[PDB]
Amino acid sequence: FAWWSGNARLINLSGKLLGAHVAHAGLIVFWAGAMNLFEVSHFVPEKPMYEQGLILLPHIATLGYGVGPGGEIIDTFPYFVSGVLHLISSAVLGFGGVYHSLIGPETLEESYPFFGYVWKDKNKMTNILGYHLIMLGLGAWLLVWKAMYFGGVYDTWAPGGGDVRVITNPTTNAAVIFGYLVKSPFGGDGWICSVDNMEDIIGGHIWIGTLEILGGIWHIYTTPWPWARRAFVWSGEAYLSYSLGAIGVMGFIACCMSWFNNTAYPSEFYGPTGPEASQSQAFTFLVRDQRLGANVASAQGPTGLGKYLMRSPTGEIIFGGETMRFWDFRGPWLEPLRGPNGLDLNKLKNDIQPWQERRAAEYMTHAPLGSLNSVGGVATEINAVNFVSPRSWLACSHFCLGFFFFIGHLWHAGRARAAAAGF
Amino acid sequence: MLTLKIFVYTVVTFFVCLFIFGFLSNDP
Amino acid sequence: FDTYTAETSAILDKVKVTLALDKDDPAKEDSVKGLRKDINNWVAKYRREPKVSGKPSFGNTYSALNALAGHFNSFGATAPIPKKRLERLQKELDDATLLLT
Amino acid sequence: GLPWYRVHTVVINDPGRLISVHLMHTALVSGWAGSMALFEISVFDPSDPVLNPMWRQGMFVLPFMTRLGITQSWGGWTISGETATNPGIWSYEGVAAAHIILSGALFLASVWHWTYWDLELFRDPRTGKTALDLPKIFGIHLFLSGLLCFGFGAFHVTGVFGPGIWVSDPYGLTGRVQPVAPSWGADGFDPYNPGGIASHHIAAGILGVLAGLFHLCVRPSIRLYFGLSMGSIETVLSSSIAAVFWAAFVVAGTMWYGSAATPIELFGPTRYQWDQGFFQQEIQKRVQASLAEGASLSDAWSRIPEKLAFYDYIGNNPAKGGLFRTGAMNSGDGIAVGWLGHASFKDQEGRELFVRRMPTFFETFPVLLLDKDGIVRADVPFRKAESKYSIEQVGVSVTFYGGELDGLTFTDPATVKKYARKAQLGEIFEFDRSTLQSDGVFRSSPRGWFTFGHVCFALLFFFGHIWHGARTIFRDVFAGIDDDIND
Amino acid sequence: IAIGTYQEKRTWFDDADDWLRQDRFVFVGWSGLLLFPCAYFALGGWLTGTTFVTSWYTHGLATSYLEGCNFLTAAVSTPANSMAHSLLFVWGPEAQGDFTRWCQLGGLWAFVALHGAFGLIGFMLRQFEIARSVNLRPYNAIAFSAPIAVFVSVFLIYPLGQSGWFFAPSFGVAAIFRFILFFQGFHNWTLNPFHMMGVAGVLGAALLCAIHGATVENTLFEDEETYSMVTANRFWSQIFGVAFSNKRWLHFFMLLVPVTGLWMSAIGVVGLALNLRAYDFVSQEIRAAEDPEFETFYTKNILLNEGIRAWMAAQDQPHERLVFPEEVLPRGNAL
Amino acid sequence: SSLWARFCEWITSTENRLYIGWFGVIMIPCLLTATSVFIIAFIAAPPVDIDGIREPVSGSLLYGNNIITGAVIPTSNAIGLHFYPIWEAASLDEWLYNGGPYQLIVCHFLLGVYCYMGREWELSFRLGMRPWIAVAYSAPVAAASAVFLVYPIGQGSFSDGMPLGISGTFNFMIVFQAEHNILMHPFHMLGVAGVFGGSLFSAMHGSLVTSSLIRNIVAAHGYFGRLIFQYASFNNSRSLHFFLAAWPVIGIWFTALGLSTMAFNLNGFNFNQSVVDSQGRVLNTWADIINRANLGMEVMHERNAH
Amino acid sequence: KLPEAYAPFAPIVDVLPVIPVFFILLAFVWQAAVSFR
Amino acid sequence: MNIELALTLVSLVLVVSAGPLVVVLLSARGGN
Amino acid sequence: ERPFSDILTSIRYWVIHSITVPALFIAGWLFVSTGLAYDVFGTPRPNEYFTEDRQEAPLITDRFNALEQVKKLSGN
Amino acid sequence: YPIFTVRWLAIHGIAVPTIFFLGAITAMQFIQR
Amino acid sequence: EPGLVTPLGTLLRPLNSEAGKVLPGWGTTVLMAVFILLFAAFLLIILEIYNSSLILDDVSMSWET
Ligand SMILES: CC1=C(/C=C/C(C)=C/C=C/C(C)=C/C=C/C=C(C)/C=C/C=C(C)/C=C/C2=C(C)CCCC2(C)C)C(C)(C)CCC1
Ligand SMILES: CCCCCCCCO[C@@H]1O[C@H](CO)[C@@H](O)[C@H](O)[C@H]1O
C-alpha cells in the first residue's frame, strides 16, 4: 500500500488497529466536548436555541437538563458539566490511543489471547460483537433509567407547551412498539419517524436494550451456524462493508428523523419542522383574520376556494393554500384544536389559547423553508432574517454522510467479494 | 379495487420470494 | 372503554373542585399543583390511545384541560381566569360531563 | 472500397476527373441559380413596390439581379412598378435561362472531360507522370481573375460600357441603377459610398493582373516550396478553404451591418437602423421642418412618404424572426395594404404622450406611454392586474395624422389600447392576413437569412481549413495525394 | 542546411528555428511567439481587471476586489452599449491614450478577449507543431477546434450580431451565470435543438468517460493493451445488449461525441446572435390564450421567460433608461 | 434435474444473449411496468392538477401536445408525500386526475435502476472483473434518486419532482433556480466542472489514442508533456484511467448531494446587497442581476390565483 | 455564557472546536516530513 | 492596517520560495 | 537545465530572494494603502461613488465623446 | 548555465506579478470598508 | 502508355510542363513578407475605418453618403 492507503496496512496489526480506533474515538469525544463548550460560550440564555445555530444544546435539553415549562432555560451549568466531562474523557481516550498505537504491543495475538483476533476466526470476533452489543444495550438501558428515574425527559406534548416530566408507564406492549417497523414510509405513516409520544420512545428503547443484551450474550456463547458461514464473506474488509452499509442507513434514517419528527427533537429547541412553519403561518393568518372579523369557516370567504380551511383528499378539514401538502403535520399547539375529522370548526373559534398563538407566530417567523447558506430568508432573499434552521444543517450533513457511507458499502463489499473469490 | 390489490400483492410477493430464494440458492 | 370514563369523571370532578375554591386560600394553590400533576398524567395516558381519541368527549376534555394548563403556564396561578375563557372552559366541562353519560 | 466519407477522393490523382467533378459542381450551382430565379419570378408580385417590396416576399436572388442591373421582366413589368417596354434579352427570365443553358453546357463538358481523363497535357515530359504545375496554374488563373475584376470595375460599375450598380438615397426612397464615378479619395473607402466599389474593383483588378504576371513568370523558392508543401493539391485545397471562409465572414458582416453593396430597398432595412431610430429621426426632422414653416400637424404628417414610414416599423427588422418560421415576411403578420398615420396620444389634461418603442431583444414588451420628460404617464397593466395608471383611469385619447386615418380622434379605451399596442411596434400599418393565412408572427428578411447561412458556412469552413490543412501538413502519417519537386 | 536533394547555406532563419524548437523544459516553438505573449497578457489582464478595474461606469456595478467583491462576484465586465462594437484600443478615439480612462471605459475586456483569442489560435498552432515534431496524427488539434469554435461563436460572433460588446459574456463567475440566465429569459435557449445537441454531446462524453475509465480498472490482467478486451465486450454485450467491438472505434467515438455536440451548440449560438428563435409552437400559445383552462409546460416556460425579461431588463440594460410601474410587471397573481 | 434447479441455472446462466441474474429478476418487471405506464401516459392521459387547485395542466399527447412539450405531470399537490396507488383512489379517472401514474412510474423505475446497478455488480463478479463499474454507475442513479425522490421528500410533496418530459425538465430547472439559486451553489458548480472535465478528458484521451494507434504510448506521453508541462503526469495508464473515471463520477456525486441540500432548503450563496459605500447605499453587482432574474422567475411561478 | 470562574478561557474554547482539522493537517505534515510522498 | 503586519506577512510568504520543489518532478524527466 | 534540487539548497538563492520578495510584498501593500490603486485604475473610493447632483449609477451615452463624459461622471 | 533563460523569464513573469498581487490583496483584506 | 494527343493539349503543354523547378535559397521571400505586412496594415486601416475607430475628415462612415 502507498502512503495514502497507509492505514490499510493495519489490517493484521491488531495492537496498532486498536490504538487507531481508540484514537479516533478520542477525537470524536474531544469534538463533542469542545463544541459543547463553544455552544455554551455563545448561548445568551434568553433567546431560543434555534435562533443561534445550536445543535448539541438542544440534544442536552431534550434529556431534561436545565429546562422548564415551555422550554425555558432554568440554568446553564449542566451543559458546561457535560462538555467538561466529555472533554476530559476525550483526553483519557487520546492518551490510550497514543499508547496502544505506538508504545503498546504491535500484535495482541500472542501475548494476550483474550484480546487477540484473526479476521478469519469466526468465533473470537463474534465474542467481540457480543461484548460491544452488551455495551450498546447497557447504554440504552442507561437512557431508559434516566427517563423513568433520576429526573425526567422533556416531553413536548405536555399541555401548556410541554415541560420536563418523568415517564412512569412506558409503552412496553410488543405490538405497539414493533408496529412502527412495519409501518409504511410515506405520507402520514412515517415509519419510525412518526413516533409522537415519549412513552413509545422509552418503551422502544427498553425493548432494544433488552434485545441487544440478549443478542450479545447469545453471539458470545454461540458459534455461527454453518449456513451463516456459507452465506457471508469472512474478512476484515467485508465486516467494514457491512458496518458502512448499516451506518449509512442509520445516517439516512437520522436525516429523516431530524427533518420530520418533533417529539424526539422538540420544536422548542430545534425549531419548527418543515411542515410546522407552514402550518404555523396558516394558523396565524387564520387567527388574525378571525380577530379582524372574517369568516374562517369558508377559508377567505368563498366556499369554492381554500385558503384557511379545505377538505382533504380523504375528507378531512385541513388548512388551505399550499399547506394542503402538509396536512399530516401534528403539533402540540395544534392537536387540541383537531377533532375526529381533522380540524374542528367549533374548536377553531373561542378555543385558541394565547400560548398557541405565540408559538405559531414564533415558528412562522423562523421557517426552515427559508435558508440561504447562513443568510436565511424565504426563497429570493436579500438581507436580514439570518436564520438557517439547525434541522436543515443536521438533515443535509447526515444525509451526505449516509450517502458517502453507502458508497463505502458498495466499494468495500465489491472489493471483499472479489478478494474472497480470488480476483 | 380489491381484486386489483390482491393481484398486485400476489405478483409482488411472488417476485420478491423468487428473488430471495435466488440469493438463497447456492450463492454465498 | 378501558375504564376511561372513571378517570374522566375523576378529572372533571377535581377540575370543578379546584375551580370551586377561593383565590386567597393556599389550598387553592396546593390543589393547583395537584390538578396540574393529574392533568399531565391524564393527557399522557389518554392522548396516545386512538380508541379513546375517537370519542368527542375526549376532544372536549383535551381542549378544556389544555386551555386550563396554558392559563396556569404563563401569567396564571395566582392570576384569576378571564371571564369569557372561564365560561368557555366550564361549558366544555359541562359538555364532557353530559356526554360521558 | 473507400468509406462513404472518402469516395470522392478517387479523383485526387486524376487532373481530368478533378476538372470533371469541378465542372459538375459548377453546373449544379448555375442550374440552381437559374431554377431559383425562375421560381422566384413565378412567385413574385410586382403590383405594389412601396408597401409590398421585393424583400418582403422572400425574394433571394432577385435582390442580386436587381443590384447589378436587371430591372425588367418579359412579363411587361419592372422592379420600379412601371410598364416594361422592350425588355431586351437581359431580363430576369433571360438571366435565369442564361444560367440554365450554362449549366447544361457545363454538364456536357464535365461528361466529356470525365470520359477522356487520360490526356497528354496532364503528364509532364520530364517524368511522364500526371503532375500539375500548381504555381503556374495559380499564376494563370489569378491573372484571369484580376483581368475580370478590372473589367467589371471599369466597365460595369463605372457605366462606361455596363449599366451600373444600384444606387439609393440614404433613406432608401429613390433608388435605381445608375453608373458611379470612381472615388479614389479617402471617401472611396466609405463602405456606404457606391463609387468605392468601382474604385476598389479597378485597383484590385490592376494589382491582380500584376500579381498574376509575377506569380506566373517567377518560380517559387525551394524553402517556400518545401515549407508550404507546394507539390500537393491538398495544400491548395486547404488554402482555398481558408480564403473562402474569410470572404464569407467579410461578406456576411457587410450584409448584416449594411453597406453600399446591400441597399435597404433590396435586402430590407437593418436592425441597427431601428436600434438608433434612423428613420424615426429622419421623419421627426421632416415634420419639425414642415411645422417650422407654418403648416399643420395633419399636413406635415401627410407630407411624409409611405415608404419612409414603412421603414420605421419593427416588423421589417431582420432581428425580429425565427429560425423555424419559414416563408416570406408577408407570410407572417400579413401583407401591408396601407398606412394608418401617426398616432399622437394625449392624456385628459392635455399633455402629449409617446409610446416606449419595443427594443429588438424583447419578444413581448410592456405598453408604456411617457411624457416629454420620460416619466411614465400611462401604461397598460399586465393581464388582469390592479390598475393605477391605466389608460381608462388616465383618459388617454389618440388622434391620427396623415395616412388612411387623418384627423380622426378615438377616446374609446379599447381602441386606444389597441392602437397603443400597435404603435409600440413603430409606425402603425394596416395588414391583410387572409390572402396568405398569415400566422401573425414575425419572419426574417433576406438579410438575416443570408447572414445566418453564410456565417454558419464560414464557421464550418474554418473546421474545413483545420482538417484539410492537417492532412496537408501530416501527409507522412496519413495517406493521399503525391507530390513532386525539381531543381 | 541540406534541405531536399540540394543544399543551401544556413541563414538567420535556420538559427532561429534551431533555437526555438530545441528540447527544453518549456517547448517554445514558432507558435510560442504568438501563444506566450497573447495568453500571458490575457491572463494578466483578467487578473488585473478582477483585482483593480471597476465597472461602475460601464454597467453601474462593482466587479473588483477593492470594491468588496469576492472571487465569485468579481468580473471583467464588457464596455457600455454606447461604444457599440468599438475595438477600444488604448490609443483609440475613446481612450485617447489615457490608461485610467481606458480602464474605466471597459477596454480591458476587449484587450483580454482579443489577446486571448489570439492565444487560443497560438495554442492550436502549438498543438500542430508539437504533433509534427513527434510525428503523430494531429487529432488533438481537431478535437480542440470545438472549444475555439465555441469561444468565437459566444464571445465574438454573438456580440457582433447584437448591438455591441455590452451583451457579450463578462469574464466572471456571477457574470457568466447572468449571461446564462439572459439567454434563458430572452432567447428560450433550452428549447433550441442546438443546445439540446450540445447537452446530449456533453452528457454522452461524460458517460463514455466514466464507462471507459471503469471498464479499464475493471479488466486489467492480474499481474498499451493492459486490460482484457474480450471480457469487456462480453460484459457490455450481456448488459445493455450492444458493445464496442474494437478499441479504435471506441476512442474515435469518445473523440467525436463532445466535439460535434459543442459544434452544434456553437451553430445555435450563431442563430441566437442573429436573434433567430427556435421551436416556437405558436399553436400552444394561441390555444392557451383562447382557452384559459388549457395549460402546458411550454406555456409556463413562456410565462417564466416573460417574467425573467421584465424583471431583469430594468438593471441588466441601464442604457435603455426603462422604468416599469409595479402594475405592468408580470406576476403570477395577475395571470 | 428438478424444475427449480433448471430455472435457477437458467437465471444464473451467462450463456444467454442478455444476462438476467437474480437482481434482474426484480429489475425486469419493474422496468417493463414503468416503461409501459410511461408510454401509455405520455401518449394519452387526462390533464393533471399538479398545483392541487382545480386548474389541471395537460402534458400528454392527444390533448394538444407534441413530443418536445409533452411530459408526465407529477402527482397533485393535494396528495403530497402520500402513497397513491390505484386501489387507494376512488376511481380510475380520479386516479389519473391527481397524477398517480407519475408516482407509479417513479417508484417502479427507481426500483428498476437500483436492481440494474445490482445486476451490473452481479455480472462483474460472475465474469471475474473488478467491481468498480457499479460504483461508477452509482452516480447517475444517485442523481436520479435525488431528482425524482429526496427532493419531493424535502419539499414535502411529489409535485416538486422533475416532470417526465423535456419542457417539464426545463420548467423544473427554472423553478429550482428561482427557489434555491442553484447556480451559485458550489455543488452544481462541482457538477458542471465534473461534466466539463469529463468531456475534455474524453476528447483528449480519444485524440491521443487515435493518433498513437498506428497500423507509441510513450510518444503520446511525451507529446502531452511538451504541450502542457505534465512530464510526470500519471505513473502509467492505470492512474490515468482511474482519474478519467473518477472525475465525472465525483462531480455527479457532489451535484446530487447539492440538490439534496437544496431539497432540505440549504440553498446556495447569495451576495445580494453585499457591497455598500460609506453612506450605506447599496452598490449593485452581478449577483444582484441574478437575484433580479430569480425574483422574476419566482413571481411568475407563484400561481396564487385559485 | 461560561461561568465567571472560567470566563478568561473564552479564546481557548473559541479555538478548541477547530482542533481536529488541525490534527488531520498535522497528519498530512507528518506524512510529508518523513517524505514517502 | 499597520505596515508591521505587512512585514509579518512578507516574512511568512518568503518561505513560499519553495516553488521549485513543486516543479522539480516535472523537470525530473530525461527526455533523451 | 539546472535541476530544481540544488537551487533549493544555495546561499545565493535564499539571500537575493529573502531580500527581494518582502520588498515586493511591501510594495503591493503600499500601492493599495496609499490610495494609488484608486487613482491609477480609476476605481472610485467608497466615499465618492455618488457625487453631488448624481444620486444614481453613471451611464455613458456618447461613444466618440466618452473621455470627458467619463471624466464628468467620475466627479472630475 | 545562463543567468537569464526562457524558463527563468517564464517563472519570473509568473511569480513577480503573483507576489505583487498577493501583497495587494492582503492589504485589501484589512480595508476598513 | 501515352495519353490522348489533342490540338488543345499540344497548345497548352508548355504551361502545364516546367513543373517542379524552384529558385535556390529563400528567393523572394522577404519581398512577399513586406507585401504581407503592407496588406495587414491596409486591412487594419479599413477595419478601423469601418469600425469608426479611425475617423478621417474626408470620410463620413454613415448612411448619409
Ligand atoms: C493589464 C495590462 C498590462 C499588464 C498585464 C499583466 C501580465 C499583468 C499580470 C497579472 C498577474 C499575473 C497577476 C497575478 C495574479 C496571481 C494571484 C492573484 C494569486 C492567486 C492565488 C490564489 C488566489 C491561491 C489559491 C489557493 C491554492 C492554489 C492552494 C489551495 C488554497 C487556494 C485555492 C486558496 C500591460 C502591461 C499589458 C499594459 C496594458 C494593461
Ligand atoms: C483565482 C484568483 C483569486 C484571487 C483571490 C480571491 C479572493 C479575494 O478575496 C476577497 O477580497 C475582498 C477584498 O475586499 C474581500 O472583500 C472578499 O471577502 C474576499 O473574498
Side-chain angles (χ1 to χ4, degrees), chain A residues 61-62 67-71 153-165 167 195-199 201 261-271 273 276 329-336 355 359 363 391, chain C residues 40 43-44 47 62 66 73:
Chain A
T62 307
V67 287
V153 292
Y154 186 85
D155 189 18
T156 179
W157 295 94
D163 54 346
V164 63
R165 84 176 172 100
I167 313 303
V195 55
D196 48 347
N197 47 352
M198 213 78 183
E199 324 276 349
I201 294 183
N261 190 270
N262 60 2
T263 303
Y265 298 88
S267 181
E268 299 89 354
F269 313 123
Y270 295 92
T273 77
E276 187 161 19
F329 159 76
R330 260 61 185 177
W333 51 265
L334 192 53
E335 285 329 289
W355 72 271
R359 279 211 187 289
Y363 294 162
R391 292 185 180 269
Chain C
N40 296 115
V43 67
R47 76 167 292 277
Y62 193 13
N66 189 359
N73 189 28

Side-chain angles (χ1 to χ4, degrees), chain D residues 1 112 137 165 233 260 316 327 398 401 435 453 477:
Chain D
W112 192 98
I137 307 164
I165 55 157
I233 193 67
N316 307 346
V398 62
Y401 303 124
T435 305
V477 305

Side-chain angles (χ1 to χ4, degrees), chain E residues 40-41 44-45 47-48 99 102 108 111, chain J residues 13-14 17-18 21-22 25:
Chain E
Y40 171 65
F41 285 139
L47 291 157
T48 312
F99 178 83
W102 180 60
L108 215 62
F111 170 89
Chain J
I14 278 292
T18 304
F21 275 54
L22 279 186
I25 284 156

Side-chain angles (χ1 to χ4, degrees), chain A residues 124-401:
Chain A
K124 176 62 208 178
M125 293 213 321
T126 311
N127 298 4
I128 303 168
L129 163 63
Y131 303 144
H132 292 134
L133 264 175
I134 289 186
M135 290 307 304
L136 281 175
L138 291 182
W141 262 111
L142 171 57
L143 163 69
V144 163
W145 173 78
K146 170 65 192 63
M148 294 183 286
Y149 320 124
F150 204 87
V153 292
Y154 186 85
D155 189 18
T156 179
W157 295 94
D163 54 346
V164 63
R165 84 176 172 100
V166 163
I167 313 303
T168 63
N169 291 350
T171 300
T172 184
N173 184 16
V176 173
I177 290 304
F178 281 91
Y180 287 98
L181 302 186
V182 297
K183 177 176 299 187
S184 71
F186 271 105
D189 306 356
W191 201 49
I192 77 175
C193 305
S194 68
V195 55
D196 48 347
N197 47 352
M198 213 78 183
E199 324 276 349
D200 288 355
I201 294 183
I202 301 316
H205 269 93
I206 286 186
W207 267 98
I208 197 66
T210 56
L211 284 180
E212 277 182 356
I213 293 181
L214 262 66
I217 295 180
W218 159 269
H219 291 114
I220 279 170
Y221 279 121
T222 51
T223 179
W225 299 118
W227 63 277
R229 316 166 90 101
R230 179 212 81 94
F232 288 100
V233 172
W234 301 80
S235 61
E237 53 185 359
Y239 315 125
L240 184 53
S241 70
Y242 314 147
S243 292
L244 292 194
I247 198 168
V249 170
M250 303 175 155
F252 284 125
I253 296 173
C255 170
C256 292
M257 187 66 203
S258 64
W259 181 253
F260 280 104
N261 190 270
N262 60 2
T263 303
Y265 298 88
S267 181
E268 299 89 354
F269 313 123
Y270 295 92
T273 77
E276 187 161 19
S278 198
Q279 294 275 320
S280 302
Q281 176 189 3
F283 185 82
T284 44
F285 284 168
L286 188 152
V287 71
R288 297 274 167 75
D289 272 26
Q290 178 177 172
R291 191 184 301 120
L292 299 185
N295 191 6
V296 299
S298 54
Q300 277 288 149
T303 186
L305 277 297
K307 178 63 206 67
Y308 293 143
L309 285 181
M310 185 180 288
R311 303 282 296 174
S312 83
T314 57
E316 274 78 17
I317 306 293
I318 68 174
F319 284 116
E322 188 181 356
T323 63
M324 63 183 111
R325 68 168 60 184
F326 297 130
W327 76 280
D328 286 295
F329 159 76
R330 260 61 185 177
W333 51 265
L334 192 53
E335 285 329 289
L337 277 76
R338 173 178 276 101
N341 292 356
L343 302 171
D344 195 13
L345 276 296
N346 179 30
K347 290 179 179 67
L348 269 172
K349 64 182 181 293
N350 301 113
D351 275 350
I352 297 191
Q353 277 299 288
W355 72 271
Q356 301 172 350
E357 196 163 356
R358 261 89 60 86
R359 279 211 187 289
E362 197 73 24
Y363 294 162
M364 182 179 72
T365 55
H366 296 85
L369 275 299
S371 160
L372 275 80
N373 198 343
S374 184
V375 178
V378 182
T380 69
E381 185 253 349
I382 43 173
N383 275 116
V385 194
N386 292 4
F387 174 76
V388 174
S389 186
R391 292 185 180 269
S392 298
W393 279 116
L394 291 169
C396 296
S397 63
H398 273 92
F399 183 96
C400 293
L401 294 169

